[PDB]
Ligand binder design. Structure first.
Ligand code: A3R
Ligand code: NA
Length: 174
């Protein structure tokens, strides 16, 4: 019922990847945890964050505003667990560094560390879009940091092929 993932490519024992839209995957799989690539104020404008919020008919944004009002912003590299609304049981909002604003790229390791508190997650590549991190570097940090089962949704077919191709070089390099 829950967590019925299909059609993924196995990269390691715990990291999987698929050329798919993350919202479509969540609707098909009804996962326990879906990952949002967030900013510290939980303002869902564009990217994965906008996609998930629209699919919840803006419920995610209202909940986030309420969370922020009570608790204040997240830290870069931090996370919070909120409702997954109609897409998942829970949504893990993770804030990767915004390299375009000069934030420290090493904090991407902190962001993916949050994945290790959940048995299985559907997730995007953190900081690889609006936040300006290299998608390949984001995959490297994911692969090196996450010990739990992470299912990565990469919607662009050209990016998917480049990531898989670059991953092979990473394994044979050392
Ligand atoms: N709907 C999508 N399904 C699967 N993958 C997606 C989807 N939309 C974007 N992506 C990809 O997921 C990766 C992460 O991109 P973003 O969603 O912009 O995340 P990020 O760079 O951490 O920036 C977070 C900001 C925080 C808010 O301002 C809105 N987005 C990139 O490779 C995107 O091309
Ligand atoms: Na699936």
């Amino acid at each position: 019922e829950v967590n019925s993932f299909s059609g993924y490519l196995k990269l390691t024992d715990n990291v999987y990847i698929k050329n798919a839209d993350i919202v479509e995957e969540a609707k098909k799989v009804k996962p326990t945890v879906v990952v949002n690539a967030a900013n510290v104020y939980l303002k869902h404008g564009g990217g994965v964050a906008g996609a998930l919020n629209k699919a919840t008919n803006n419920a995610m944004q209202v909940e986030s505003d309420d969370y922020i009002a009570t608790n204040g912003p997240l830290k870069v590299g931090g996370s919070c667990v909120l409702s997954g609304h109609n897409l998942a049981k829970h949504c893990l909002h993770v804030v990767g560094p915004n390299v375009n604003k000069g934030e420290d790229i090493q904090l991407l390791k902190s962001a993916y560390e949050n994945f290790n508190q959940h048995e299985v997650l559907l997730a995007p590549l953190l900081s690889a879009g609006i936040f300006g991190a290299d998608p390949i570097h984001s995959l490297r940090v994911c692969v090196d940091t996450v010990r739990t089962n992470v299912y990565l949704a990469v919607f662009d077919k050209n990016l998917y092929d480049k990531l898989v191709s670059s991953f092979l070089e990473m394994k044979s390099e050392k």
